[PDB]
Amino acid sequence: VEQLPVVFEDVVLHQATILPKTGTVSLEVRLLEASRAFEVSENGNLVVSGKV
Amino acid sequence: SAAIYNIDTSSESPDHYLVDHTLDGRVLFPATGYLSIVWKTLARALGLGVEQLPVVFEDVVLHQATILPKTGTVSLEVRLLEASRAFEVSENGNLVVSGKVYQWDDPDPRLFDHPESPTPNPTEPLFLAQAEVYKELRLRGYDYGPHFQGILEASLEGDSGRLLWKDNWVSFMDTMLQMSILGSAKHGLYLPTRVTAIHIDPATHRQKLYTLQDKAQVADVVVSRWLRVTVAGGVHISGLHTESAPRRQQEQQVPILEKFCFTPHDSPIFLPVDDTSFRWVESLKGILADEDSSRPVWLKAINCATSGVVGLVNCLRREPGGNRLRCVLLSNLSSTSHVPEVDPGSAELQKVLQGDLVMNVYRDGAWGAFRHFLLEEDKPEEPTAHAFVSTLTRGDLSSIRWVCSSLRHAQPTCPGAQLCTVYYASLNFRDIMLATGKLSPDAIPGKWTSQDSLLGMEFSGRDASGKRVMGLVPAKGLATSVLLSPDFLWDVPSNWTLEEAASVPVVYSTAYYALVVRGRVRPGETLLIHSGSGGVGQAAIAIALSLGCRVFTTVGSAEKRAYLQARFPQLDSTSFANSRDTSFEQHVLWHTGGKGVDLVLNSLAEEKLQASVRCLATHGRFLEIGKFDLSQNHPLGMAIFLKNVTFHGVLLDAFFNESSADWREVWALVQAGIRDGVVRPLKCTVFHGAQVEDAFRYMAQGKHIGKVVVQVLAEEPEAVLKGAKPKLMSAISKTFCPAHKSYIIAGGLGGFGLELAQWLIQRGVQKLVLTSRSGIRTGYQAKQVRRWRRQGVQVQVSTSNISSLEGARGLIAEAAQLGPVGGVFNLAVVLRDGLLENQTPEFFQDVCKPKYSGTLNLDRVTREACPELDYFVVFSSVSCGRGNAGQSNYGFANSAMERICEKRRHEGLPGLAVQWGAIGDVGILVEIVSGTLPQRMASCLEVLDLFLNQPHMVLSSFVLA
Amino acid sequence: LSLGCRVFTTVGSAEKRAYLQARFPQLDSTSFANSRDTSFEQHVLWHTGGKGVDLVLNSLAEEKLQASVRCLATHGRFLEIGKFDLSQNHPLGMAIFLKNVTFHG
Ligand SMILES: NC(=O)C1=CN([C@@H]2O[C@H](COP(=O)(O)OP(=O)(O)OC[C@H]3O[C@@H](n4cnc5c(N)ncnc54)[C@H](OP(=O)(O)O)[C@@H]3O)[C@@H](O)[C@H]2O)C=CC1
Ligand SMILES: NC(=O)C1=CN([C@@H]2O[C@H](COP(=O)(O)OP(=O)(O)OC[C@H]3O[C@@H](n4cnc5c(N)ncnc54)[C@H](OP(=O)(O)O)[C@@H]3O)[C@@H](O)[C@H]2O)C=CC1
Ligand SMILES: NC(=O)C1=CN([C@@H]2O[C@H](COP(=O)(O)OP(=O)(O)OC[C@H]3O[C@@H](n4cnc5c(N)ncnc54)[C@H](OP(=O)(O)O)[C@@H]3O)[C@@H](O)[C@H]2O)C=CC1
């Protein structure tokens, strides 16, 4: 991470993830490198979209 | 995650059918192939089968075409973002297809209900068969194989038909796209690039399928261009967008073009072929019966000089026994009546026999033969006053030449149209893109022919009355003369020069339309102009400063900054930003107090566009005059419209389609700006008309400031010249036909007949008389004829047989009823093949009725009552030139036709015999031959255009292997 | 109707259709489509001969907004009256502007 300068573009936050007091929230990050895009989902629900 | 698909086109591979999806000599992966591959990936993700997964694609974008090599495999990676419902097909890390794919949760069968046609089909009995449909598609450039030949029947309009279902979704939806593009007026290789929506419901697709008597499952397809949908079975393709992919110049069709010209140098059996009843053929068979005494066979024709036994001998040599029989012609082809007329009963025959030549022809005292020579590669250049600049090969500035215009062969005179001599023509950005190939000619609005050159959008010169004018034209502005409506002309003021005025129309009309008509710019409004040093940029600067508007201009260099400072002293140092970077946005937002700019005249692309969107203030107006982001359907965040922002797509070209009062408003604005001094001509870099190529590349390099102008004609010192005629210049000859003349094509309802008729229509023919024995039978013929009639062409389908003299007279009279006969084309043919052994004189008579007797009658009637005839063309075969097995009669008829044409040309009347080889995509050989591939029809038409402007009597075109 | 214009009104009920017809007799049966689905698009594209409408007064959102955009003719004016798609920064395909279309927020 510290060796990789990065650019995010058109980042959209579709919903807010509430971190529970106990337990764990699973976040799925999927990269479309050719599209230069990314997606962050909680339980198959779109949370964050944009390009990276 | 990433589902890999190794597309292999080998015979054993399950995807071998993709070899049959060929688009201009290349095997392309279909867009519907991507649809099916994404469908498979989504079914795998959901753990379903494709047949059980109703799916919806949305905003499908094809970013590149995948090349499937003959040897090897191509890996396509499909990645799904299920949360965002998106997909991504990539090849070797390069994005290929993008869009949204998702399971159709509630499949509605009513979606796959065929929309009602806008009008009922009258020609229900006459439809386009499968062979006709795919011959037309192959003409357009789609070399589809049997696997993708799924259209069995289609209507003439192309709005309905039936698609054959081979349990293959790729082929089915590809034929759906083929049906969609079948009724497309645009010509060329159109490939899909975007689809708005694609709903596939296999559940109702199975129900929609029905089986014919052939026991093959078919589905009714309806293409509604009004609703922009295509519905077939359980597939609904809405919002399909196709762009014209340029055809690769690496075409193997490099035809061999030749000239057929006269070149001076046991017991004999004499065969006289001068008989018109062909009763000697059986006697010739008797000559083939013997072996030893048949060696000196002398086949002599002494009565008719147009006997044409040359092709007979050439073909008979190929047949068995011809070489042993040594069949050699002794043809007395005397071109002029005052000829020696050598007697064959004298010592001349003895000398000919002693020579034992393969052929002997007597031409006005010369004992020679007929030989093929290589045709000169130099294009025929002629002195004309009407020529235009055209790129001979697309994308190559080196192949930029002046070619004869349609105005010299056809002079139009009608109200509302003016022919203006052009002294100066300004190169524009669109012209550079067209010449460099970055812009498709079909992208320009208007009815443009395939051979039409659209270079030039602006001109200055003198109208018919001699008044000094400057004009805005949709295309063809780079011509020595233009034909434009007077509504697109402005008088050049006395203080201006023609060179100075050549830069005003396009640039200032664009700026005025963007700012005043569209942007509605008010005085004192802060305003951003992209590429201010450019033409449209400079005009926008002038207009904005005329209103006292604060102007921020983006420029690409310090020299352009200095030029803009000197040209417009009202611009301070804070009015200039960089156009090659995004930093201009910050600059603007720093110098406007963060509010923004009221207007943004933007010609920049990609993020530089988006930054220009960010520069907008509240109630801002974004005038997009660029095209890259517009053509690519790039996304635009609509939150900018929360600033009360207006977004105008400013296209001036839309003024050439209607030319209503909306254009008159812009014309009045430009005239007022000229009168008020607001409109000031830009700096012009002038290149002489003799060298337009260097101007094109110089402006392509982009260092030019202002405008680049080609000086077609130097401006003589005067106000209104009475003459104002263009000067004569040497230009490449191009065949064009007057609109007031009628043209006859014998057998014009045939394949080559229809194609040549279409080519003539593209060359300015407005009166056509296609004669055929059987009339209109096939759906393709009816479609072509009705399309030409709707185009405004007077096409007459006659049944007059040129074989009979009375029939030819009636045909010529019917043509003269439309207008004076300017050209007669003899393509009528009947074929009676077979070796000389199984040949009968009746077959010779039938084969010579359209070609031999038909050309006799055409020549006679044209000589009698066609004084103004320009073209007398007949289509012979290379079987005449060299010889074909089992086609002796065909060669004889072709040689007779060639003799007729040679005699006609020697006398002085027009005469042309074209020795065509195997003809591709159309004809008799399609419904490797003799070592020659079938020449594709586009190449055939190009070669015909070359031949029609040649002084040689007979020429041949054929492609070797 | 004061300007003598052809009008295509999208309503989501039959009672709304009847009320509009009674209120504006100049509207005909072909003047009404459905505002609860994309279908109105086709209706417009059928009754304009595939040309489209000159002006769109759009208060709908999402796929209905996209369908309304697809209803624009050449030199068409799209007047966004709604705010959901504006507030959400939904992407708008920048190819309708190739039809000399002006988008009004
Ligand atoms: N919508 C419409 O109807 C019309 C649109 N146009 C478009 O408007 C745009 C501007 O018009 P126009 O001023 O005549 O184009 P010009 O050639 O006159 O200049 C446009 C600017 O493009 C910049 N540029 C950057 N790189 C290049 C390059 N390699 N070659 C040429 N130019 C380059 C240059 O400015 P810089 O380097 O300073 O950035 C150039 O000044 C054109 O792209 C043109 O296609 C034109 C007429 C009508
Ligand atoms: N296609 C090829 O491969 C080659 C073609 N050519 C030349 O191309 C020309 C066109 O032939 P092709 O491409 O095969 O097109 P077609 O053979 O398909 O059409 C032939 C046309 O000839 C018409 N025809 C024949 N005789 C007469 C007549 N006496 N009066 C009116 N019409 C007649 C026929 O009319 P009907 O409809 O009544 O039958 C038929 O429509 C021919 O001159 C041929 O020599 C030369 C070499 C190769
Ligand atoms: N941007 C601006 O300047 C202004 C915008 N507006 C916008 O105009 C749009 C409509 O406003 P307006 O016409 O006055 O509202 P109305 O209450 O008069 O009706 C709005 C229409 O929207 C439909 N509709 C859909 N859902 C509902 C719902 N839950 N409740 C009521 N109606 C619904 C109805 O038509 P149908 O049911 O048949 O689909 C209804 O007729 C709004 O989005 C509003 O934001 C209003 C004023 C200013």
C70 lines ligand 3 (CB under 6 A): no
Can you name the residues that pair with B780 across neighbouring β-strands?
A: none
Evaluate whether B477 touches B390 at the Cβ level (below 8 Å).
no
Contacts of B664 (CB under 8 A, 6+ apart): B487
Burial tier of B794 (Cβ tally within 10 Å: 0-12, 13-18, 19+): middle
Evaluate whether B142 touches B115 at the Cβ level (below 8 Å).
no
Query: Cα dihedral sign for B293, B296, B297, B303?
Result: negative
CA atoms within 13 A on the CB side of B584: 33
Query: Cα dihedral sign for B272, B273, B274, B280?
Result: positive
Which residue among B634, B641, B654 places its CB closest to the CB of C105?
A: B641
**Nearest atom in ligand 2 to B850's CA:** 29
Contacts of B512 (CB under 8 A, 6+ apart): B539, B543, B666, B669, B670, B673
Contacts of B430 (CB under 8 A, 6+ apart): B439, B444, B457
Sheet of strand A28-32: strand arrangement = A9-13, A46-51, A37-41, A28-32
Q: Nearest CA to B325 among B276, B275, B290?
A: B290
Can you name the residues that pair with B958 across neighbouring β-strands?
A: B256
Evaluate whether C20 touches C9 at the Cβ level (below 8 Å).
yes
Neighbours of B352 (CB within 10 A): 20
Residues, chain C, total? 105
The pocket around ligand 1, CB under 6 angstroms, is made up of B 428-430, 506-507, 510, 531, 533-537, 555-556, 560, 579, 603, 625-626, 650-653, 702
Evaluate whether B861 touches B900 at the Cβ level (below 8 Å).
no
Evaluate whether B156 touches B786 at the Cβ level (below 8 Å).
yes
Evaluate whether B258 touches B374 at the Cβ level (below 8 Å).
yes
Evaluate whether C58 touches C65 at the Cβ level (below 8 Å).
yes
What distance in Å separates the CA atoms of residue B543 and residue B338, rounded to the nearest whole number?
77
Identify the residue whose tokens are 């994005």. B95
Amino acid at B519: G
Amino acid at B622: F
Q: Nearest CA to C65 among C88, C49, C48?
A: C88
Backbone angles phi, psi at B874, to 5 degrees: -130, 150
Which ligand has the nearest atom to the CA of B845?
Answer: 2
Contacts of B211 (CB under 8 A, 6+ apart): B217, B218
Task: Check A45 against B93: CB less than 8 A apart.
Answer: no
Using alpha carbons, list the distances in angstroms from residue B329 to B264, B356, B482, B653, B841: 15, 11, 54, 63, 19
CA atoms within 13 A on the CB side of B124: 4
3-class secondary structure, C80: strand
Where in the sequence numbering do the catalytic residues of B fall? 21, 174
C82 lines ligand 3 (CB under 6 A): yes
The chain B residue lying nearest A29, using CA atoms, is: B81
Which ligand has the nearest atom to the CA of C9?
Answer: 3
Task: Check B84 against A33: CB less than 8 A apart.
Answer: no
B748 is in an annotated binding site: yes
**Nearest atom in ligand 1 to B705's CA:** 41
For chain A, list the contacting chains (3+ Cβ pairs, <8 Å): B
Instruction: Say whether residue B446 is in contact with chain C using an 8 A CB cutoff.
Output: no
CA B121 to chain centre: 28
Which residue among B643, B646, B649 places its CB closest to the CB of C98?
A: B649
Dig out the tokens for B509 from the structure.
Answer: 């009309």
User: Which region, left, alpha or beta, applies to residue B47 given φ > 0 means left and ψ of -120 to 50 means alpha?
Assistant: left
Q: Nearest CA to A34 among B94, B60, B2?
A: B94
Evaluate whether B925 touches B885 at the Cβ level (below 8 Å).
no
Task: Check A10 against B90: CB less than 8 A apart.
Answer: no
Dig out the tokens for B390 from the structure.
Answer: 């055209």
Ligand 2 pocket mutation, candidates B135, B772, B925, B959, criterion most atoms within 8 A of CB: B772
Dig out the tokens for B532 from the structure.
Answer: 């201010």
What distance in Å separates the CA atoms of residue B782 and residue B938, rounded to the nearest whole number?
21
CA B872 to chain centre: 25
Neighbours of B89 (CB within 10 A): 27
Task: Check C102 against B648: CB less than 8 A apart.
Answer: yes
What distance in Å separates the CA atoms of residue B21 and residue B148, rounded to the nearest whole number?
6
Instruction: Say whether residue C14 is in contact with chain B using an 8 A CB cutoff.
Output: no
Backbone angles phi, psi at C76, to 5 degrees: -85, 150
Helix (H) or strand (E) holding B871: strand B871-877
DSSP E strand stretches across chain C: 9-11, 32-34, 53-58, 72-80, 91-93, 102-104
Experimental approach? cryo-EM
Evaluate whether B172 touches B163 at the Cβ level (below 8 Å).
yes
What distance in Å separates the CA atoms of residue B167 and residue B186, rounded to the nearest whole number?
31
What distance in Å separates the CA atoms of residue B589 and residue B608, rounded to the nearest whole number?
14
Q: Nearest CA to B234 among B144, B104, B134, B48?
A: B104
3-class secondary structure, B813: helix
C81 lines ligand 3 (CB under 6 A): yes
Instruction: Say whether residue C95 is in contact with chain B using an 8 A CB cutoff.
Output: yes
Contacts of B647 in chain C (CB under 8 A): 97, 102-104
What distance in Å separates the CA atoms of residue B544 and residue B511, rounded to the nearest whole number?
10
What distance in Å separates the CA atoms of residue C52 and residue C70, rounded to the nearest whole number?
8
The alpha carbon of residue C2 is apart from the nearest alpha carbon of chain B, in Å, by 23
Contacts of A47 in chain B (CB under 8 A): 83
Burial tier of B662 (Cβ tally within 10 Å: 0-12, 13-18, 19+): middle
CA B302 to chain centre: 47
Dig out the tokens for B582 from the structure.
Answer: 């995004």
Burial tier of B376 (Cβ tally within 10 Å: 0-12, 13-18, 19+): exposed
3-class secondary structure, B800: coil
3-class secondary structure, B825: strand
Dig out the tokens for B283 from the structure.
Answer: 């006697």
DSSP B114: P
Evaluate whether B718 touches B512 at the Cβ level (below 8 Å).
no
Report angle CA A25, A28, A33 to the nearest 5 degrees.
160
CA C19 to chain centre: 19
Contacts of C61 in chain B (CB under 8 A): none
**Nearest atom in ligand 1 to B556's CA:** 38
Report angle CA B879, B896, B927 to the nearest 5 degrees.
40
